[PDB]
Design an enzyme around this catalytic site. Sequence first.
Site, short mmCIF file in Angstrom:
data_model
loop_
_atom_site.label_atom_id
_atom_site.label_comp_id
_atom_site.label_asym_id
_atom_site.label_seq_id
_atom_site.Cartn_x
_atom_site.Cartn_y
_atom_site.Cartn_z
N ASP B 357 18.61 26.81 57.04
CA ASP B 357 18.90 27.15 58.43
C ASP B 357 18.44 28.56 58.79
O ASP B 357 17.81 29.24 57.99
CB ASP B 357 20.39 26.96 58.73
CG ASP B 357 20.64 26.49 60.15
OD1 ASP B 357 20.94 27.35 61.02
OD2 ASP B 357 20.53 25.28 60.41
N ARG B 434 22.37 35.14 74.44
CA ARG B 434 22.48 35.32 72.99
C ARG B 434 21.41 36.29 72.45
O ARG B 434 20.73 35.99 71.46
CB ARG B 434 22.41 33.98 72.25
CG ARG B 434 22.98 34.02 70.84
CD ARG B 434 22.36 32.96 69.96
NE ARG B 434 22.87 33.03 68.60
CZ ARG B 434 22.48 32.22 67.62
NH1 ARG B 434 21.59 31.27 67.86
NH2 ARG B 434 23.00 32.36 66.40
N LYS B 467 14.43 20.84 62.19
CA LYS B 467 15.43 20.90 63.24
C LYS B 467 14.97 21.90 64.30
O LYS B 467 14.97 23.11 64.08
CB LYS B 467 16.78 21.31 62.66
CG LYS B 467 17.94 21.26 63.64
CD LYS B 467 19.19 21.88 63.02
CE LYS B 467 20.30 22.06 64.04
NZ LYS B 467 21.39 22.93 63.52
N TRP B 468 14.57 21.37 65.46
CA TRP B 468 14.03 22.18 66.55
C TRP B 468 15.15 22.53 67.53
O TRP B 468 15.68 21.65 68.21
CB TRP B 468 12.93 21.39 67.26
CG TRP B 468 12.18 22.12 68.34
CD1 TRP B 468 12.69 22.58 69.52
CD2 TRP B 468 10.78 22.42 68.35
NE1 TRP B 468 11.69 23.18 70.26
CE2 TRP B 468 10.51 23.09 69.57
CE3 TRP B 468 9.73 22.20 67.46
CZ2 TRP B 468 9.23 23.53 69.90
CZ3 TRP B 468 8.47 22.65 67.79
CH2 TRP B 468 8.23 23.30 69.01
N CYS B 517 17.46 19.95 68.98
CA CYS B 517 18.77 20.56 69.08
C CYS B 517 18.78 21.59 70.21
O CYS B 517 17.74 22.13 70.58
CB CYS B 517 19.14 21.23 67.76
SG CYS B 517 20.76 22.02 67.74
N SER B 518 19.97 21.85 70.76
CA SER B 518 20.11 22.87 71.79
C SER B 518 21.55 23.34 71.90
O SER B 518 22.27 22.92 72.81
CB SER B 518 19.62 22.34 73.14
OG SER B 518 19.79 23.32 74.15
N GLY B 520 23.84 22.43 70.10
CA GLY B 520 24.49 21.13 70.14
C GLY B 520 23.63 20.16 70.92
O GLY B 520 22.42 20.08 70.70
N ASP B 525 18.69 13.92 75.90
CA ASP B 525 18.15 13.13 77.00
C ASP B 525 16.98 12.28 76.50
O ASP B 525 16.45 12.53 75.42
CB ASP B 525 17.71 14.06 78.14
CG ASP B 525 16.58 14.99 77.74
OD1 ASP B 525 15.42 14.51 77.64
OD2 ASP B 525 16.83 16.20 77.56
N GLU B 605 38.42 17.24 47.28
CA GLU B 605 37.52 17.15 48.42
C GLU B 605 36.09 16.81 48.01
O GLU B 605 35.38 16.10 48.73
CB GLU B 605 37.56 18.44 49.24
CG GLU B 605 38.86 18.63 50.00
CD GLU B 605 38.99 20.01 50.61
OE1 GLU B 605 38.40 20.97 50.07
OE2 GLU B 605 39.70 20.14 51.64
#
Lengths: 718, 718, 143, 146
Positions: B357, B434, B467-468, B517-518, B520, B525, B605
């Site tokens: 990430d 941001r 992941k864009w 991604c944006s 979230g 769309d 877990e």
Amino acid sequence: KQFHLRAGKASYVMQLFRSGYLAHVYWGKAVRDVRGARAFPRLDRAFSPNPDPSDRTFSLDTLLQEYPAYGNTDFRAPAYQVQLENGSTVTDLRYKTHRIYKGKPRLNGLPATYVEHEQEAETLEIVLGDALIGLEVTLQYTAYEKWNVITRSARFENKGGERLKLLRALSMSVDFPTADYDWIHLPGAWGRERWIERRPLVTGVQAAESRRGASSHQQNPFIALVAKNADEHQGEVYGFSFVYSGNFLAQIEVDQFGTARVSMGINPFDFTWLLQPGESFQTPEVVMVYSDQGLNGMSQTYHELYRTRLARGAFRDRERPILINNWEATYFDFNEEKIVNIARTEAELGIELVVLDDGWFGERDDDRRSLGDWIVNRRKLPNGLDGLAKQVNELGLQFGLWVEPEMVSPNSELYRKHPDWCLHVPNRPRSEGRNQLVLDYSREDVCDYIIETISNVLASAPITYVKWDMNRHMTEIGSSALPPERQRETAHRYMLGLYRVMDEITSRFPHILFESCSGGGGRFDPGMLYYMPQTWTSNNTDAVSRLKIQYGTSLVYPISAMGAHVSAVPNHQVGRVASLKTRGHVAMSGNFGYELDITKLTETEKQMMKQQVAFYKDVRRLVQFGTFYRLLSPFEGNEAAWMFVSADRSEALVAYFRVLAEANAPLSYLRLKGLDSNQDYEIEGLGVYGGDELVYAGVALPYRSSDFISMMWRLKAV
Amino acid sequence: KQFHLRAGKASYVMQLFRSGYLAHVYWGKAVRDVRGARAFPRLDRAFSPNPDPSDRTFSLDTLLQEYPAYGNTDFRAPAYQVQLENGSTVTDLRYKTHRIYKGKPRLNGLPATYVEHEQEAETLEIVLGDALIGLEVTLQYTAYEKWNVITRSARFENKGGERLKLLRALSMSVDFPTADYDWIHLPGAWGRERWIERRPLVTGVQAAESRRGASSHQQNPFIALVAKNADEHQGEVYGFSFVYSGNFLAQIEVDQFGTARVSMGINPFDFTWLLQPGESFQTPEVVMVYSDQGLNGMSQTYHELYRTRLARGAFRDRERPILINNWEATYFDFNEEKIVNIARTEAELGIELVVLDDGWFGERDDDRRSLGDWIVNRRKLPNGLDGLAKQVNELGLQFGLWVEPEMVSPNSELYRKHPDWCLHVPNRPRSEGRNQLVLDYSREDVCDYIIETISNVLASAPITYVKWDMNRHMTEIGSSALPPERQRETAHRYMLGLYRVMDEITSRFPHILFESCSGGGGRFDPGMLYYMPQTWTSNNTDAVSRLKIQYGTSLVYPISAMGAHVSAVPNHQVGRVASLKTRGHVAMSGNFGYELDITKLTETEKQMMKQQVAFYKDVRRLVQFGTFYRLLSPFEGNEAAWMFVSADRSEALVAYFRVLAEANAPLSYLRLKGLDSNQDYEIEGLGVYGGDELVYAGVALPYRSSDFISMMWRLKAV
Amino acid sequence: RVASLKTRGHVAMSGNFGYELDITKLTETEKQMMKQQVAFYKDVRRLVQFGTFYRLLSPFEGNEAAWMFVSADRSEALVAYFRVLAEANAPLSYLRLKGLDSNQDYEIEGLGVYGGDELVYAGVALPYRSSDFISMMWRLKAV
Amino acid sequence: TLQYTAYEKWNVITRSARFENKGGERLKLLRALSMSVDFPTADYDWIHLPGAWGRERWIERRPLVTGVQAAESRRGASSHQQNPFIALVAKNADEHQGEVYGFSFVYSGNFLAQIEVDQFGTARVSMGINPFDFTWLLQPGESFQT
Ligand SMILES: OC[C@H]1O[C@H](OC[C@H]2O[C@H](O[C@]3(CO)O[C@H](CO)[C@@H](O)[C@@H]3O)[C@H](O)[C@@H](O)[C@@H]2O)[C@H](O)[C@@H](O)[C@H]1O
């Protein structure tokens, strides 16, 4: 740095925020101070960007505002938008200065609520500025001492050296901190204006509006935010009324954080305004009413304000004449002899005014002709207007006249002389409504012509009443006297033109009572009320249909402006047959008058008319100037009810209506409002009742059969 | 002169009216023929003007239309608006010709639903024209054979001598004869996207929209008309889905005569487009779905269409890998050996993909710099991307990468070298979201740079997943590379550029699984789905919160594209503690993955996590490619339930959730859907039950205390 | 259900207050809260048990519950607010009051002086909080 | 003997009934409610307090039906399942405004709290000891207090 306006028993609070940002704080019941105005959680909301890098808790997307813009961190719908010569639309208004003074200013070229004394109101002007482009916006706030009224408008001024194109210029905007409300607007159509529609708010955009060049039958320029449990008699209500008779937008937007932005003004659609250096633009005002006394509390505020401080002229406080209008009676088929001969009968009945409607001019024998040719039809009226008016006067009757000066028929002398005087665009077919066209009131020569022409007509005869009608909506909106870059200003310039024309004409004739009309109540808005103190409510004159139309109209507009006529049955609009007694009771609930052929009436009916006239004259002052209370809604059930109460609550008139009869029906009871609990009232014919009993227990209603029944009770303190 | 489109079990009918006007006739369940299409009262509506003066019964204000304009007798909101050089906005499109062919055209520079073979669909192109100005508009209609899907879009072409400004260019518009419906849209916010909202229509205007340059978390580009009695399982439903990722308007207008106009397309606000002589403008498409089988029937059509005929690439029909994001385990501060160490134990758990990430590039030690500088950070990754990825590969894991190419930090090499490359307007402060700015994708130099730079990164290592992301919305929208008269085209050109960049990059790397991604689901769309077969649903990963978000998202979008990850408790977004069992069940009801520090996990877990991974692999094909049925709504009560059914109805997976615990609660029951009632079903570890019993009677749910519980049943036919 | 000790106390202090749990199983930091809870309740017991009670927000109608106790002379008051399920990125919360004297100012312990009219007609901005089953309590004293 | 008490400082009316056999026959009371009142109209909602063990007295608001609605107990106790309390409220009445009519039973056993709307839109509200499985014999000279 907090602004606090005291309107009646309501407070409207604003404050400055950081680098000169104007923020909304509170609008509601009067508080002495809003100490918690800055003590709210400061959050960095994801995807709400920041104009100031040193404080990410601040965004214009999360700030309650008074006049928001789009482009620099706010994503909600803006109250205004400006395009620069560079093509960008970013503007940045910051606090420049402010001023407070007693009284209320006039708005340039526009109608507005006013004061007779400086002590009646206080005005706050907050001047905002965008230094880079030289744009200055003065936000005008006015708080009345006597009423819970806040009026808002804005004035744009180009004090820079570039051209500024206004794409949007709403009169006001206000961000409510929460959105737990219903909204009410007044949708409708011809023959059924201003029905009350209550809806829950949605997360997004809801709006009533008009793209018709007129305020319209379809949507009236009024919206309201109401508390979920608020009704006619209690609960918080926030009214928004637009003092303008043209295109409008009344919008509520609810955003991601449950805030509700209510904005109102000239419809941005098909609208731009060019501001050269030195030029300015004044928006119409929006009148805002707060009430915690429910819908009646809100309406009663609007009634007083609009009747005494918006409506003008010598008849503002005068009782209105009971008239007879011949339109439904004869239409276009009439002559001088038939009118003068029946006038003697009309005077005998107690009628005070005879109004000659459409068809007296040019070759107006149908609705396809002669609009623009305001010369008397010598064939129909051999002795002219002056002859007819004098004949009618001699019988103790006033004389009224119908005109539609904003229009021109293709088949007319005027149109053959000046085909370019109409609204149009180059090389496009000229669409017609009712076979007529719209005159270009954005041109001074057209306006000058109309002022002179109509004045000559009004001065050629002892006319004391005018019905100014307007039976069409604008298409192909354009002007040959405007450059391409100002074409989109046509519809608003038209309205400014009309306002100037009406102002000059009405001032030339102070002894004339002007009633505005637009194929019914197609322009029943506060803007028209300023120039003509009464309005023809609807072309639908059916007693039952008028229950909804008048109930809905009363939501904003005073009864004194609400014209209502008794017409013949079967009704010409719906075919419904209601008794004369019921027709009278509905019409007597408004600005009473007649509109039917008297030569077709039996002696019984003519005798009932005479008693109707006598009765209304006895309660006229109470109906047209007393306080109005809505009791039972025709939108909620089978009944309609309301009442009128004097200022000292000594006298009252109660009206009740049941439309559909039910066999073996339950017993009905009516509770009253606005009476003094500590006094007893003699209900005429019933007996003495206690004020408290009439309000807390109510009165038993007589069991009656048949459809469309009515009842009126006169109340007097003892 | 009747056009009849036949899409699955549905009919869409249009007809030519009088002088080449295109009228809407019918959209609903399939009929052989609409014989009463012209047999309706031709009425003279008051104030509805006539394009033909001789006939008062004809008006565009009262004609059900396909692509309405404003200005020449229609007063409702138009589908399009054009300004001429003369300043006028009057246009008049008439029928010219039409063509019909098998298949479906690609839209120029835009995403769109497609076909693999001609016979899959039929396209009708109606060519309209305004001969005066040489404006040609082609209405594009496509009807799929196996689905109740109609797709609409418009193509403008200036064949005139003058320039034309499109002030508005919606993709479609349609007038329903009646308005007795509710409407559904998907409002929301960051961390709570796409909540379902059902509202009754208002007489006036309702709309969902976005002014953020992105489809947004706040409003998804989707609306629906539903019958008042329609639910998830039955009733008529009309869905409207916008295949575009930028600004949109989705509006429903109800007029005076009970007609409902639904229109959708690029948001007119802050939008213009200049058509020089010879230039074209293609709108994005809107996908229109009809169903008489409730909201599930509508969604299931969308799911199948979008998963197989919108999404593209090698992974369209392939199962999607269970991935891990080691973000919250280290934030920005990581190195090569810290990643490979935890990756070993992740491979032991059954994970298939490890996603590196944000932080791998430039000097990304915080979220305040380095955006734009897409080179490997040698401090953190001494062996570069190729070194890390190949170590990850030799553990049996795939390697994924996080990028945000549409953004640029002020503090970066790129911004210092090209400060003008961002979206901005002259002399105005560049607002940050941001601590970053937006790159101007409307420019070719920026697009060409990103394309090459990103390709170099994707080629530098065995990366099979990307992941864009995009974490900010547009402000001060403008371009230094555009002339002033094209400034308002910036946002749309931005999106056309991004579409071209994504298209070329995904083309160069066919073996890569791209996930958009944006912050979230800020652009969840159909437009994005065309370029990247899956999407990160929300940054709120809380199991209970995810119930509403996933329920809402599933209304339009297939489960195959709906990312859902297990995260740690207490939840970072809401602070909720729910057990790993239900966190697993919620996430397994979508595109499954993990986002949590494995080093902080207990042995218990880690055990359960191993089982969840093993379990999901068994049901993955069913979840990602099966038929989806919603059973209980978290928007309507304390529960949430849905189920997946295979195409042959031999297998099914049921998920049930209860939020708040109730003491001494009533027994609960759950009825299933989509099963073959003729067959019996083996519920693993429970017993055999008939399909009829499961659907008509239901399954008894085990009584259970404690908050936030979940259950999963596996069903198999006998 | 696992709710905090502060929340449980705030609910119980809205009625006839008492305890029913194992003290030996409580931590030292928890015991110190009990001491404060017991002490606090004694200060407001007469108000709680004998004052005028107003319901403000219904838990039957949504995610919140709120009520308040007002002294008979309206000089003293106590306000409790509760939110059950937290939502991410939630809107700002506001609470209106009842039964206060409009013509008087009140000092909220922990916040400041507010007009009685302001609290009843405008309401007070609520602090932004996460996590489920939260509660807040405020003592009010007329100046 | 119908017993009515009106408090001075509160809006409280209390009602109860006292039976007495002065005749020479035996009299069996099949039903002996404490009160009954006929409202002129029936345009109200009604509120009662249904519940269970562990969740007593949830507030339930419902519109009136044309016929019979009732909260009752047959458990020999007032019970968790239904609290002996009903209320007629105006349609728009809430916590802070509007007309409300409360009916509270001062008794801890079986009860019937009933609202009955007839053909002419009147609303009969009646409350008292549950007539179900209940009788009471009155020998000549005996009395009964509700
Ligand atoms: O001309 C006098 C008359 O004008 C104003 O209202 C006229 C009103 O009538 C029309 O309504 C109808 C209904 O379809 O429309 C057709 C023709 O357009 C008529 O047959 C029919 O009446 C017009 O369409 C409307 O435009 C117009 O408003 C005025 O309100 C009347 O009082 C009266 O003075």
